[PDB]
A paper describes a structure:
Glutathionyl-hydroquinone reductases (GHRs) belong to the glutathione transferase (GST) family of enzymes and catalyze efficiently the reduction of hydrophobic, bulky glutathionyl-hydroquinones. One of the most studied GHRs from a biochemical point of view is the protein ECM4 from the yeast Saccharomyces cerevisiae (ScECM4).
ScECM4 exhibited no GSH in the active site but rather glycerol molecules. As expected, the monomer of ScECM4 exhibited the GST fold and dimerized with the pattern specific to GSTXs. The N-terminal domain (G11-K196) adopted the thioredoxin fold (β1α1β2α2β3β4α3) and the C-terminal domain (K197-E372) was found to be all helical (α4α5α5’α6α7α8α9). The typical features of GSTXs were also present: a long N-terminal end (37-residues), an extended loop between β2 and α2 (V70-R140) and a unique dimerization mode by the helical domain. G11 was hydrogen-bonded with E230, at the C-terminal end of helix α4. The loop β2-α2 (residues V70-R140) was the second distinctiveness of ScECM4, and probably the most striking one. The side chain of S115 and the main chain of A117 were hydrogen-bonded to the side chain of E236 in the helix α5 of the other monomer.
Author numbering:
A (entry chain B): 11 to 83, 95 to 109, 115 to 370
B (entry chain A): 11 to 83, 94 to 106, 115 to 372
The structure:
């Protein structure tokens, strides 16, 4: 009765040496959902690496029906969130809602209504799931890569350095000095937290649900310990009153913002708004039960534009509650918790 | 898509002057579910008024199927505060653990509470609800309205059969009667039944109206208790926690029926109503400090409350019986713990 995530099929890279996919401005596109934590990784990374004008973005609807992610039928393409803005209750919003630049964008290059149209163009024999994110090549009309862990490495690589400014080129979310630390952390966070919440919420037998939920909270406890130890050291170094200096080095790995933080964030920012109620990951919440994770996630959300302005809590809450009929059969979106993220 | 609770049909009383239903030991029986907050009112009141050996009790299974509450196929059990009732994945909906999932119906061997209803009135055609206050002599339902059963138990009706300490206990003192009734009225509509109008709503517009109403009224209760705590802190000093708590109640300065009626909802709120009925702006433990102190004082410090509160029956009943809310019948393991200790 367990959930098994399928392996992603499109696994190519972009580099000056690549025979097909070489770096250029105006060539590649990023198709995402704002509700998906995997695709969220790519949006955050695109922003932190200064690539919003280099790689355009479009956004599928938050409602996921049986035919897969769908679209509605320049300032937006090159925006951190593809131009989506949260509207100024959920009950009046139906699953077929058509608020252009609120629920979704269009697909601007071909007018496709379905993300499956891109998959079939790339591989007419494709037979797997039509997932987001998709890194798309406009020249060959193919999917370069649809594995979020690899897309973020492509984005952080030197590939696009000619087309970005001096400050962003220098940002390195996977420094060699921390690479074993990042890769370790990522491995167990993936299995027990990023994917752990899905193995918990999609379980169809309680035995699997219980095993997986225990494993989620056991690993949140590990993260919380790492952060608690780091906070102790920073408080000794700077004094607890100098909160600003403390937060400037308050990260999961090392003393700087890395990929490990990005990958954790996309799960943690969804945890209280969705995963507690909807995936039954409910021993406690981040805000009530995990002070150091809670501080860490609020620092990233409130103080980093790449996190705040790619985080759409309406897409998050509506996607899960409205799409997963075997969890929420009537599609009624809970109004709580309030607020979606507490202030810092 | 709104939930309209039926009016209870059996509304008679027991008294010395009554032509039919006079008080006696060994004559009346109380049939309950430990999951039901309405029936829970009657168990608490039965204990507080010292009536456990006067009025026997039997307990239906926590699983509620389409044919209604059911029994499984002893002196100490019948006269116990909870009828003798002593991970969830291993417990199936057809679980048959005698004295754990349910008791038997010991007078007639009925397998269904509907059997008692049809015995009393062969033309009955509403829902077969708990609690039931049953007369063994006429084989009828005296009263199936929890708000009236607790008045019967509190009345002078059974005073000849209890000790003097219990006889003097009065859960509806005259000086507080009107305030008890007025508090009870809005707590009923907005909290006791408010959580059910919220969780059983099948249209989002009704869900949202009712959930906002629940939290608006919990705010009202919290204000009452905060003001009362402030007065007690002045009367006694914050250090005298035992003297403060000895007067820390919803109406006046003593335990009343108003506390009992609020408690059966509040004790279920974090274990069930937050996740399952989507009453989730916040939780009691995180969001309502004065309600949280009040309910922990009742649970831990009054045996009539603690030893009638069965969190397995509570969690299993709701999550395993409400298929249109929880289609796969998977009981969340959290929140942990069911009720927090009263840490000073």
């Amino acid at each position: 009765g367990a959930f098994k995530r399928q392996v992603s099929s499109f696994r190519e890279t972009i580099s000056k040496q690549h025979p097909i996919y070489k770096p250029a401005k105006g060539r590649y596109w990023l198709y995402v959902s704002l509700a998906c934590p995997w695709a969220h990784r790519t949006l955050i990374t695109r922003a932190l690496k200064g690539l919003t004008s280099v790689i355009g973005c479009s956004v599928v609807h938050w409602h996921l029906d049986e035919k897969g992610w769908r679209f509605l039928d320049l300032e937006h393409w090159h925006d951190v969130a593809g131009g989506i803005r949260t509207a100024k209750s959920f009950a009046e919003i139906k699953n077929d809602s058509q608020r252009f630049m609120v629920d979704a964008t269009n697909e601007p290059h071909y007018g496709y209504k379905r993300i499956s149209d891109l998959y079939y163009k790339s591989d007419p024999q494709y037979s797997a799931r039509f997932t987001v994110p998709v890194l798309w090549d406009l020249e060959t009309q193919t999917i370069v890569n649809n594995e979020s862990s690899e897309i973020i490495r492509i984005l952080n690589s030197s590939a696009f350095d000619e087309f970005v400014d001096d400050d962003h080129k220098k940002t390195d979310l996977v420094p060699a000095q921390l690479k074993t630390q990042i890769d370790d952390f990522n491995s167990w966070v993936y299995d027990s937290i990023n994917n752990g919440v899905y193995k918990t919420g999609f379980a169809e037998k309680a035995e699997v649900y219980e095993s997986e939920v225990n494993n989620v909270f056991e690993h949140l406890d590990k993260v919380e310990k790492i952060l608690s130890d780091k906070y102790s050291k920073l408080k000794a170094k700077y004094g607890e009153e100098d909160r600003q200096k403390i937060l400037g080095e308050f990260f999961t790995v090392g003393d700087q913002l890395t990929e490990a933080d990005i990958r954790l964030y996309t799960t943690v920012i969804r945890f209280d708004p969705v995963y507690v109620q909807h995936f039954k990951c409910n021993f406690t919440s981040i805000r009530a039960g995990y002070p150091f994770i809670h501080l860490w996630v609020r620092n990233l959300y409130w103080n980093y534009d790449a996190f705040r302005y790619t985080t759409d809590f309406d897409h998050i809450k509506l996607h899960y509650t409205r799409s997963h009929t075997r969890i929420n059969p009537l599609g009624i979106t809970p109004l709580g918790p309030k607020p979606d993220i507490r202030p810092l």
